[model samples]
Target chain A: MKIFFITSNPGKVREVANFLGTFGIEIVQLKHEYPEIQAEKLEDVVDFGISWLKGKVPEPFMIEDSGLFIESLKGFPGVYSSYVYRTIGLEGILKLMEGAEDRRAYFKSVIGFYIDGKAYKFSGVTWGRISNEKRGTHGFGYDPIFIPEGSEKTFAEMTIEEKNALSHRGKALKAFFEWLKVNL
Target chain B: MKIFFITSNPGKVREVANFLGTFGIEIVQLKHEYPEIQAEKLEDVVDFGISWLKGKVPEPFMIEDSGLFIESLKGFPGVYSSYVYRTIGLEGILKLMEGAEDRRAYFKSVIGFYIDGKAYKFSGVTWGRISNEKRGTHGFGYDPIFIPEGSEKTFAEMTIEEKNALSHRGKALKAFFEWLKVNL
Candidate 1:
């Protein structure tokens, strides 16, 4: 069975495709832009995206949104992670965390699946902490500054397989695949 | 002629009422919450909001959105100014801007007016710069950390009349009033 993923990022499509490929499911990248509201939660953002893209796009499609939330900063870039990364970048985050006592953070991903005229949501979270400084050159965005729990190296220091095993998006994809196995 | 100002801020309604009162236009505060999209520009957010609230809300109503954009920060907290203010806040902004050469910034406001099944937009901008630190206790949000182009004091240090005279919302309200005068 083939499912469409509405996103501009080819890398995301590749990741999703690779995950579902084991189950004989094909993923097609649907390059489309949809309105994402400035909501407080990733679930709300994903829900709104799916609702906006419902009639405009093909069914059996999915969309995803993820964010890095800092505990001490009160989730400074929770829902606006993309914008924050582009503007302040990782360096700015470190600057804000200078001399901070609490550095706890987490990455959360929400996947909104619309299939058979019904909508379903799957989500995952990975609790961690912001690194004292950026490390490694492996991943992108906040990866260099994020140290997942149970690991000494930042996400950017880990390989694709290593990172995916503990990534929020990876867990969300696993949940989605489990549901599809039974419901598809 | 009375028009509804859809907002949670009574202070904003008061400002609009005081501005339009000179033209004999009455402003009624209508407390309503509308979804604001995460758009790069305030205009796009306002347009989407007006479109969404068109049929749901009463006609001859207006909604307004404003943001502060720091040139050095590449328009950080532009459309998500409210969210940013709540999270990282003035201290965080100062930290991000530590040792910054350029201090240029601006405040922008977009007023979405919907009436007679049509929508109109009026906007205003006030050039300014981020202050070194929080200075005053009068205004809310980023007011204490923002200084208008010609003013030495921060926005929070100024009186309501003084701040409005050089405010983005004030200018937008003036433009809206002019249009209403001719069209009403």
Candidate 2:
């Protein structure tokens, strides 16, 4: 099956491709820019993204938006994680967590697939906390500082196999693939 | 004079406070929580935030949204810096720019102030690039790895005075203060 992954992030492309590879799916990137509509929630953004790409691309396409929500911050930067990341980066977050005990946070990925002008939504979440300091040498985004529940190693420290096994993207991709088997 | 400085980050609060202090105006934090809207563009977020916050907090308040845009990744995590930082940390960004010729990036701040139910917006931008390695011990966030343009010292290396003199927050706050003096 062929699906267009509507993103420019090579890291995301690599992660999604590697995760969905086993099901005989071929993922390709949409090299051009797409209209990103303003929305208060991830679902709206995903819906808007999928709708915008429906007619432009011939093949079936999918777009993903992920975020980290901190409990202490009251689900802050939730859907806006992408915007927050650009402004404050990682260090700003550590500063925000300084002297705080509850460092609980989670990563969420919302995958929206546009098939025949209809949209399918799938989501995955990974529970964890922001580490005291950055760890490991692999992965992208908040991977280094996020230690998944029941694991001592941060996502950055884990091998691709280790990470994919429990990542939000991994879980979301799993659900997506299942949908693919049934629908696509 | 009174000015609403947008930002929940304490570090930002302190930085902005000191910057605005010089203008003989008072800087007040937006005590209430407002929905953090997401948009592909900063202007959209700020505009939405202003209207959203106006309904929540009756008082005139300011809100800020900023981003760390890395050239190499083509803004991989631009607006998503917060989530990316939590997951990947500075090392991840450094690694991404490892071999890239243009290690350039910047801090951009957008301030939206609602006064007496009327809204005003101000923007400030700092040109710089990611450092080869982390340096200095001051400031916060990606300061250690981000050196401002036309300067040898990273934001972390510069003292508060040196930083506030040239930071994006500094410039934005100054603009807001000026507006406050004239309007208020």
Candidate 3:
């Protein structure tokens, strides 16, 4: 089965494609530009994401958005995580967490799939905390400093396979794949 | 009276300062770092704008965001106008309007004022159309291509006085000033 992944990020494409390959699903990427809409809540983001896809093309595709929410910051970077990462990076996060005891955080992923003019959604989350010092050099962005709960090594320290086994995006993709297997 | 304007754009500051000068309102630009929330709707943008200001500074300050909505394109660049302008510029807009008869468009401005921990919101709009050719060099962004109704000159062609007399941001700022005079 062929599935369109609405992303231009080569890394993301590689990751998604590798994961779905196990289920014999061939992942294809659509390189068209999609408008990023501003919304207050998660539902609004999902709705806008779906609308953005619907307005673009009449093809079956899936779009995903993710966020890293810090409990201490009361979700300061929630939906704005991407922008934050672009501007401040992981070192900036460490600066924000300086001298903070409660560093609990979670990464959440939402995937919205468009098929035959209808939309299906899947979500996943991974609990974690901001580490005292940056660790590892494997993943991109915040992977170096985020330590997932019950894991001795950070995502940056783990290989792609290990990171995919427990990352929020990985879990969400798995749920989406399961749905695709049963429905598609 | 000292009034704080929450914007990093020096051009905007200059234009706004000149307009507000006539009313004896001294405009002061303040540097601030706030979370740029992603939003799609008007309310969401306003809410996020307010929260962003509140989270950053304690004193009363004002921030403005504007959108360009092309009627023929069904508001193609509405809330995402800023990003669109950054990526595509005037040439991209011309391409989008190619072979289109009705080039009607409008710019909407939302001004948010934080006073005593409360949010005061005001909006203004200017109806216009994408010109056949870029004209003038007065204002910023899409000013060169947008010709306001009942005007022989585009915003870029008009001097600061001529543009501010009818611009959406000017109108919105005028309303804000009136509110300030009455309340403060």
Candidate 4:
């Protein structure tokens, strides 16, 4: 099985390839930037992203988007996750964390696959809570400040293999690949 | 009754200035470029627009946005109306208009007013149909092909005074100006 995972994040590409290995899906990276419209839902963003790319690119490709949503933040950085990561980064998040009593949050991933100009969606969410401190430097993009439920270590504290086994993106890819096993 | 009206369209600025005059309001065009995020709803776009401009500009300013939605095109140039007009111009629109039986369409305008860093919205829509041929050179943008309801002439065929009397932007501006008379 073969597919193009359209994304620029090398880290994400590596993680996805690793997860999809068992399914025999060889994923080539389409590193071109795609226009992502602002939306209230991750699925909406993926829906628009893949739909815009369908006519421009060759078929049998996919895209993955993830967000770290804090309940206290009213799910912000929700769809603006990428922009928030760049501007306020981790420090602003830690500051916002201090003002709220409820620190509950989660990370969500959306995968959009396009084949023959038709699109499909798959998603996974990892429930977690925001941490007061930036914990470790192991992972990227809000990983240091989010602790998954039933876990003491932040995702940033985990190794690549360890993180991928349970990451929202990994789970999403896993879910998507599972469907591909039967359909493709 | 003096306020800032943020927009790049001179035609709209002229129309708004005329409409607000009856309420003793003076509109000064800020002519400042503000970033507008891609959104499905005009109100959402206006919400974000005014909020973004709140801190950047002095208080009590307003922004106006309009869209051309064609039923057959499924609102191809809905929120992307201005961008589409810029890239494709009137020719591209007329090309898309070819062979469509249901020529039903409308022009919608949204006005966002910011006071004390909070946002308020006013909207108006002109229900009409696209003309089979470009009508006149009196107006700008897609005015040539858009025929307002109960009128034989396209907006382009009307003088500024004529179009402003019944334009969607005029109606929305009228609503806002009426509100301003009491609130301001």
The numbered model that scores best in lDDT is 1
- Per-residue CA lDDT of model 3 for A7-50, tens digit only, reads 76676677678888888988899887664555445555765667
True contacts kept of each: 0.97, 0.06, 0.12, 0.12
lDDT of 1 by residue, B95-134 (tens): 8899999999999999999988888999999998888888
Tens digits of per-residue lDDT for model 2, B31-128: 55544444565667788767766666646677887777776666556556665566557876776565679888888878888777687888889989
Share of reference contacts kept by candidate 1: 0.97
Instruction: Give TM per candidate.
Output: 0.96, 0.56, 0.55, 0.54
Residue by residue across A1-184, what tens digits does model 1's lDDT show? 9889999866566567877887899888888899889888999999889988989988789999989999889987998998999998988889899999999999998999998788999998999999998899876789999999998989889876777778888899999989988986
Error of 4 at A156 (Å): 1.0
Global Cα lDDT for candidate 3:
0.77
Candidate order by TM-score, highest to lowest?
1, 2, 3, 4
Location of the lowest summed lDDT over 10 successive residues in candidate 2 chain A: A32-41
Query: How much TM-score does chain B earn in each model?
Result: 0.93, 0.90, 0.93, 0.95
Model number with the top DockQ: 1
In angstroms and one decimal each, the interface RMSD of every candidate reads 0.8, 9.4, 15.5, 18.4
Which residue runs of candidate 2 sit more than 4 Å off their true CA positions? A1-184, B4-6
Which candidate should be chosen as best, given TM-score against the real structure? 1
List, residue by residue over A34-91, the lDDT tens digit for candidate 4: 6566556788888878866887776689998888877766676676666556644676
Q: List the residue pairs that clash in candidate 3.
A: A38-B38, A38-B39, A38-B40, A39-B38, A39-B39, A39-B40
User: What are the lDDT scores of the predictions, listed in order?
Assistant: 0.87, 0.76, 0.77, 0.79
Candidate 1's displacement at residue B61, Å, is 0.3
lDDT of 3 at B135: 96
